[PDB]
């Protein structure tokens, strides 16, 4: 009937993007200063990693129940849940400030993991609900950006806030000030989400949302009887999991090939995540202008395969600035792909909920990342870095062709 | 399992890894050396013996904590 956009769309996208930033900061805070937390708690680097690995393990199971609550309860309920869990995870980490309270920090990080299942695949649902045509792909990218910027900030804030002193009493004071900051921002973002996050604007922002409005396992059966979405799940998994396996093993590579350059390995990782924030935005700003979702997806994908090859065959040319350029180009393209993939999924399966589509894409990427990381660490230890790198190139080359058999079946476009 | 390693020690020098993972050759090891697993039975083979092959060869199990050498 009437399709009107409101200005609260920005407010909602910014509040979501900000507590997604906060959640992504909580995921990486322990790692940024891992050696400091190993000493504070007296645990292994394995135990401190479990903190970062728990975010990824929780998502695969809790996706299906969380996406049901999405349609059974709504998007305000999902926002309040996610924000509240992000706040609870953060505050439980203030009964962990004693060397012997590692179980409680893990209790906190699990809660913070469960909060992500209510945040990671939600960008495309919020875009669909609040943003109209020619801006839906950009909200989704403003959220992916909120997440990437929290991973970045998180690399940079803990080494500044907490020094590498060994004193068990002053390090606790230096971790209190980080835990307090994050708790007090997760509380602020929570209280706003309860204030300003409407379940739906007054009018549908788009003609596709207006018509969407007019069994859970049946709908999961129907997304997997759709070949263009199966191909996209597989190829998104290949690309994003290769990105994960690339990032996990990036430090190890630069120390093997540039021994003594630990400062610059972390700098190269910041370059990957910063270049990625920019590509996330521009990919979305390019899609809401052109609407070229099968051709963008293929060219990017093919640019993630050219980039993995150049990285592969330039890691031992003895030039650290070349590694900066190559790793920055990958992160650029491999993070610009993620918002593009979500929106191409929403185009291939339009009436179907954006939650289920984006969550299935995320579960794939998290499965393929775990598999590729396990496989690569076994290939590198036994055959070298170039072989483990080629491994990633051959799954990217295989994914390129799979991306090309996905049809440009743009339903949300056809519904305008 | 396949947690068997074959080392070569020449007198007054450290053991050198020839084969690991039962059959996997370590990088740099002459290709004459090759190892096979057959249940709890493990066999090292030098396809062509060489002036170098004269030494002591030790089998090792790394399956359990108390690493045990042959």
């Amino acid at each position, epitope marked *: 009937s009437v399709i009107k956009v409101s200005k609260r769309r920005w407010v909602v996208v910014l509040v979501f993007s900000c507590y997604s930033l906060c959640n992504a900061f909580q995921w990486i805070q322990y790692g940024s200063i891992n050696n400091i937390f190993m000493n504070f708690y007296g645990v292994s*680097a394995f135990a401190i990693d479990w903190l970062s690995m728990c975010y990824m393990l929780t998502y695969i199971p809790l996706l299906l129940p969380v996406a049901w609550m999405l349609e059974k309860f709504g998007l305000r309920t999902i926002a309040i849940t996610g924000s509240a869990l992000n706040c609870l995870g953060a505050w439980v980490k203030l009964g962990s400030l004693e060397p012997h309270l590692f179980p409680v920090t893990m209790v906190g990080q699990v809660i913070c993991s469960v909060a992500q299942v209510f945040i990671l695949g939600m960008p495309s649902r919020i875009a669909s609900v609040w943003f109209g045509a020619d801006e839906v792909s950009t909200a989704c990218s403003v959220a992916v950006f909120g997440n990437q910027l929290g991973i970045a900030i998180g690399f940079l804030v803990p080494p500044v806030l907490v020094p590498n002193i060994k004193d068990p009493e002053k390090l606790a004071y230096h971790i209190s000030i980080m835990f307090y900051i994050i708790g007090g921002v997760a509380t602020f973002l929570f209280i706003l989400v309860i204030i300003v996050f409407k379940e739906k604007p007054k009018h549908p922002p788009s003609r596709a949302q207006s018509l969407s409005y007019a069994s859970y396992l049946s709908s999961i059966v129907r997304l997997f009887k759709n070949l263009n979405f199966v191909l996209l799940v597989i190829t998104y998994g290949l690309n994003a999991g290769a990105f994960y396996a690339l990032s996990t093993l990036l430090n190890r590579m630069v120390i093997l090939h540039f021994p003594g350059e630990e400062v610059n390995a972390g700098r190269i990782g910041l370059t990957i995540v910063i270049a990625g924030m920019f590509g996330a935005m521009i990919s979305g700003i390019w899609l809401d202008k052109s609407k070229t979702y099968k051709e963008t997806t293929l060219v990017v994908y093919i640019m993630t395969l050219v980039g993995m090859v150049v990285y592969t065959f330039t890691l031992n040319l003895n030039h650290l600035w070349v590694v900066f350029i190559t790793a920055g180009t990958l992160g650029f393209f491999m993070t610009g792909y993620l918002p593009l993939g979500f929106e191409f999924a929403v185009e291939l399966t339009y009436p179907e909920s954006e939650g289920v589509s984006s969550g299935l894409l995320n579960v794939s990427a998290q499965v393929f990342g775990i598999v590729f990381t396990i496989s690569q660490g076994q290939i590198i230890d036994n055959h070298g870095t170039m072989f483990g790198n080629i491994f990633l190139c051959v799954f990217l080359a295989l994914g390129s062709a799979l991306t090309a058999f996905i049809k440009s079946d743009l339903r949300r476009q056809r519904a305008n | 399992s396949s*947690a068997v390693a074959w080392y070569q020690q020449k007198p007054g020098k450290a053991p050198k890894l020839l084969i690991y993972s039962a059959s996997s050759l370590y990088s740099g090891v002459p290709s004459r050396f090759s190892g096979s697993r057959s249940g709890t039975d493990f066999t090292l083979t030098i396809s062509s013996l060489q002036p170098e092959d004269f030494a002591t060869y030790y089998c090792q199990q790394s*399956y359990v904590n108390p690493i045990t050498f042959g």
Partner: nanobody
Amino acid sequence: EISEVQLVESGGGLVQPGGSLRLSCAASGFNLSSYSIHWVRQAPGKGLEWVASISSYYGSTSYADSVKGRFTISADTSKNTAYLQMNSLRAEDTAVYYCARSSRYEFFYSNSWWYWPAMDYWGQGTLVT
């Protein structure tokens, strides 16, 4: 470039029975933080014998039964040096103590699922009498 990996054992010397000595193993080319270090001993009239292993990553220390309660394995990742404290040495602890490295790089996804690691690089040895 890929610096070559070297393990250098120091400390070994004659010591009186009930003597305590501390061997060291400097590590170049890799970090004791990503790899587990093992101690193996050979007596002039014996063969290779596994003493102790430490994982910095997994925070695990394992000891041979004979050495247990007299030998402590430890690692200083800040120096890339591992050590062995032999508190109550017996005349049958006279041997060439060699420090070796496992092939497996330790990280969260590290596993023995296709390839079981082995002792890749070894030191020259330091003799304790």
